[PDB]
């Protein structure tokens, strides 16, 4: 006694040992405080949001490199947590959050070493960097949470760009990959990473009634592959039979995890 834990999977009472136990059901992202982990096979804990008992880490590894739990610690933040929405209809959710709540959501501009085209303007389209070599060194100095190459030019989203929005009290809506989650954590700027999970190929067409089936299958395959690799990085997983419900859940998740005190992974 005793540490704090975070569920990386959905667990139901009845599927394991019926409701006829003192067991505790929990969903992905639930933070549990363990009281007794002495039992080799099963663990005593309580929900931090409601007192009972939860299965162990080595135990669930036996049933199904499997994902069980991650140890977490409470931390106080003084900035607004950045946002990383992933999965189907993420672009619509990103654009909708910014238009609907302009006082609490903002966006940042990526850097590039590509010569600024005449119609483009610096600071809005891109932060245009005249010296390529300078950006490559900033990349090596861990100044970028994401960086790539296109037509022999560097593109990237800097940690400073994100932090500037965050320190003005606004959630930075980020168009980045899941790999940016770890780098933001390492920069002590922990994002709310939300994964929109399609229940099936048919569900994709339900939450996105615009795209074709051919596009839906590709989006579904990308979503399944995304969940395979970055599930640990997800702050939450949301589902729905419509985009409006998904959007509804995204708003709730953001509100719940935007508190002064948050839970972050431990050693």
């Amino acid at each position: 006694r005793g540490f704090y834990i975070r569920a990386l999977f959905d667990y139901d009472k009845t599927k394991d040992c019926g409701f006829l136990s003192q067991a505790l059901s929990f969903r992905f992202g639930d933070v549990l405080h363990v009281i007794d982990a002495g039992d080799e096979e099963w663990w005593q804990a309580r929900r931090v949001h409601d007192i009972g008992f939860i299965p162990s880490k080595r135990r669930v590894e036996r049933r199904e490199s499997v994902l069980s739990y991650e140890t977490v610690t409470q931390m106080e933040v003084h900035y607004a947590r950045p946002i990383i929405i992933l999965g189907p209809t993420k672009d619509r959710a990103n654009d909708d959050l910014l238009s609907e709540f302009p006082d609490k959501f903002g966006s940042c501009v990526p850097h590039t070493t590509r010569p600024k085209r005449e119609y483009e303007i610096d600071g809005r389209d891109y932060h245009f960097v005249s010296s390529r070599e300078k950006m490559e060194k900033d990349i090596q100095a861990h100044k970028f949470i994401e960086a790539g190459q296109y037509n022999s030019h560097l593109y990237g989203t800097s940690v400073q760009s994100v932090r500037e929005v965050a320190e003005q009290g606004k959630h930075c809506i980020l168009d980045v990959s899941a790999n940016a989650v770890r780098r933001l954590q390492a920069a002590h700027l922990h994002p709310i990473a939300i994964f929109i999970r399609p229940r099936s190929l048919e569900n994709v067409l339900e939450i996105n009634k615009r795209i074709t089936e051919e596009q839906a299958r590709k989006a579904f395959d990308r979503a399944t592959k995304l969940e395979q690799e970055f599930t640990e990085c997800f702050s939450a997983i949301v589902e729905g039979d419509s985009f409006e419900e998904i959007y509804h859940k995204v708003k709730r998740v953001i509100e719940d995890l935007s508190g002064p005190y948050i839970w972050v992974p431990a050693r």
Partner: peptide, 16 residues
Amino acid sequence: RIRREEYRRAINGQSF
């Protein structure tokens, strides 16, 4: 409105 496809092709293409 926050999306730059040049940036996207840079990232989802080959990245650092």
